Amino acid sequence: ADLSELLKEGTKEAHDRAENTQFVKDFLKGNIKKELFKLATTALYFTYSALEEEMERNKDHPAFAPLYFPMELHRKEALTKDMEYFFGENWEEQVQCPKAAQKYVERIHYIGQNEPELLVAHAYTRYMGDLSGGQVLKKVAQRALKLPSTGEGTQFYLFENVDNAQQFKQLYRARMNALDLNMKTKERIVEEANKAFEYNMQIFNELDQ
Numbered sequence: 001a002d003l004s005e006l007l008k009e010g011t012k013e014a015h016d017r018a019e020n021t022q023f024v025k026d027f028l029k030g031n032i033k034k035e036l037f038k039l040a041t042t043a044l045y046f047t048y049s050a051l052e053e054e055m056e057r058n059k060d061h062p063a064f065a066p067l068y069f070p071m072e073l074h075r076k077e078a079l080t081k082d083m084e085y086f087f088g089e090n091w092e093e094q095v096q097c098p099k100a101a102q103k104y105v106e107r108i109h110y111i112g113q114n115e116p117e118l119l120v121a122h123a124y125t126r127y128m129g130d131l132s133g134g135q136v137l138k139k140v141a142q143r144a145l146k147l148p149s150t151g152e153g154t155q156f157y158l159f160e161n162v163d164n165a166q167q168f169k170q171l172y173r174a175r176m177n178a179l180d181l182n183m184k185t186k187e188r189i190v191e192e193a194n195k196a197f198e199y200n201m202q203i204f205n206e207l208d209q
């Protein structure tokens with residue numbers, strides 16, 4: 001069956017578990033204060049820094065190259081702007097990676113250096129969710145934190161180079177389903193995606209504290 005279909009069915013439960021964490025339910029209610037949002041944003045910066053370093057490393061690898069979208073998808077530059085807004089120009093000295101995020105970052109580096117055919121599990125799960133959810137999450141955070149109308153602090157959530165998210169999600173899915181993969185590796189990709197949702201849940205719960 002289609003890898004996209006296997007990922008939908010094989011990750012529904014782990015997806016729902018992460019969506020039902022206390023941090024997510026508080027955020028969507030607007031109950032997320034600035035300092036804690038700065039920590040959550042720090043976690044994203046280190047996560048997407050790692051993910052995009054590994055996608056660039058495998059940009060020519062046949063099990064990943066069709067999904068290399070630096071212009072359309074990469075978030076590191078956007079997150080850098082958000083970190084500069086929330087912390088100021090010397091933001092890099094002010095942060096440290098949260099422990100569960102550091103564990104996810106290590107797993108991304110391992111996957112990209114040792115099992116590049118699984119890197120899609122992380123890219124799909126992160127960027128397809130980002131594209132669907134960006135506008136909703138941006139509005140919630142701008143209102144709750146009273147952020148500037150001009151978009152400072154929420155550039156992570158805006159895909160400046162994706163004209164239409166539903167058309168791009170469709171293109172991305174069709175390319176993923178066309179990767180030449182047997183059922184052995186497709187099942188590992190589903191298990192790696194569930195692994196990602198687990199790291200996701202662990203980062204949320206570390207934020208909740």
Ligand SMILES: CCCCCCCCCCCCCC(=O)O
Nearest residue numbers: 027040047196197199200203204
């Ligand atoms: C989903 C709505 C809340 C967004 C708040 C930002 C905090 C993100 C924590 C998750 C980090 C990525 C983990 C993963 O790879 O799944």
